[model samples]
Target: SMKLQQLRYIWEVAHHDLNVSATAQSLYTSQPGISKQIRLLEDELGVEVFARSGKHLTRVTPAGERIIHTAGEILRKVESIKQIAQEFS
Candidate 1:
């Protein structure tokens, strides 16, 4: 399993159709950094998450879609945990 941060990075890109620049801008990270994270995640998964056409990100593969769904659930659950913690403070 990937780390939550890595999963979040992928999910953001997936939502933005794997546009590195856009994802970086939205996430407040540098484009090169986002690109590195995406590359690292793909290397770990051993699957292609995005289909590229030239410099443009064309589409997300089935594996990417599945990961997006799973990651989204995990993120939501994490948010709930934070909310619960805040209630106790």
Candidate 2:
């Protein structure tokens, strides 16, 4: 099963200019972990979210633009829900 954490990974990666290292640092995780999860997610979805040149990410793919946009909105709403729950507690 795909995890929300996986979604979170892609969202963060996109915002960090597809830099796995930057995204991992911001998330307090390792670059390899982020890279592995991203590839796993792509494998499951059968779509490449990034255009990779060797081991580096060159750009976001056309489909990835839409995926990242939706990911942003989804993550935003998820954060809002978390805040709402916090307020109720």
Candidate 3:
């Protein structure tokens, strides 16, 4: 199972001026690793999230925008759960 943390790939790619190279540099990950995660996410969801021009991402799809919003919501909720678990423990 995938974690919501994977969505950080999307958030980083989007916020780093839509540059995967910069995102990978900042996140201490490889470009291909980042690209693979994005592709895996797309494959799991059965949709194309990014618009690619000959293996290069040009932009995000309309559904991708929604995924961005939902991903953030998911991360926050998961964080809350983690915090609650910490308190209980």
Candidate 4:
């Protein structure tokens, strides 16, 4: 299951021309003890999730896009479950 930050990261980066700094700026500080120093490096895909070609983010392989869609669907299902829980409660 994707964490909350993970989901937001996908959503933010999915837009803004898939710009990572947009994500970092939007919720970078919202993370737990995620100071900017580590966050910038952390902003880089921990794995080869993306394949960027240029400095302006002019290009990157689309594995990141796939993950964004994946997270959206995952959260949709999770939200449905949560709604059910709320109804029962």
Candidate 5:
């Protein structure tokens, strides 16, 4: 099943300039791990977010632009809600 972890990976990869290596480093995870999750997320969404050139991500697809945009907003709201819950607690 899809998870928020995968969405976080997707968002981070985009923020790291679509560079999985950098994204992996920033997230303190392995490159292959990020790659695998991204592939899985793409499969789940039935869309390719990152256009690949062999083993490297070259750019975000047009559909990816939209998805990533929405993903950022979703993540933002998630964090906001978490903060709200934390404050209430």
Candidate 6:
């Protein structure tokens, strides 16, 4: 299963047009770390997420886009679960 942090990292970078440096700065992580996580995710899914143009990020594949959509829903549900637990307490 893909970790939540991994999904968030992918979504953030894709939302930002796959700019590793910008994504890392925004997430307060090292660029290399972000790249590593992205690569790991791709490997796990057996598909490329982001296409590269030299050192620049060019586009996200259709599969990546689907993952982003699903990740958003997963995060929303997770947040709702947290809120529900807090309410019971």
lDDT of each: 0.82, 0.89, 0.84, 0.55, 0.91, 0.85
The stretch of ten residues in a row with the least summed lDDT in candidate 2 is: 1-10
**Model 3 per-residue lDDT tens digits across residues 1-89:** 55565698887888886688999999998998999998888888898878899867898899989997788788778799999999999
Q: What is the Cα-based lDDT of residue 1 in candidate 3? A: 57
Instruction: Return the top candidate by lDDT.
Output: 5
3 against 6, candidate with superior TM-score:
6
TM-score of each: 0.86, 0.90, 0.82, 0.52, 0.93, 0.87
> How many pairs of residues collide in each model?
0, 0, 0, 0, 0, 0
| Rank ordering of all candidates by lDDT, starting from the highest | 5, 2, 6, 3, 1, 4
1-86 in candidate 6: lDDT tens per residue? 67888888988997776778999999999999998888898898888888777766788888878888898888889899999999
| Comparison by TM-score, 1 against 2, better one | 2
In candidate 3, stretches whose alpha carbon ends up further than 4 angstroms from where it belongs are 85-89
Per-residue lDDT, model 1, residue 31, is 81
- Model 5 over residues 1-89: C-alpha lDDT tens digits? 77788889989998989888899999998999989988998998899999998999999999999988888888899999999999999
| Model 2 bad stretches (over 4 Å) | none
Task: Estimate, for each residue in 1-89, the C-alpha lDDT of model 2 and write its tens digit.
Answer: 66678889988988888889899999998999988988898998899999999999999999888988888888899999999999998
Q: How many backbone clashes does candidate 6 have?
A: 0
Worst 10 residues of 4 by lDDT: 32-41
Which candidate model has the greater TM-score, 2 or 4? Answer: 2
Off by over 4 Å in 4: 1-4, 28-47, 53-56
Among these predictions, the greatest TM-score belongs to 5
Q: Write the residue-wise lDDT of candidate 4 on 8-84 in tens digits.
A: 55555556565666656676454333223233433654543345465334533466556667767877887899999
**Native RMSD of candidate 5 (Å):** 1.0
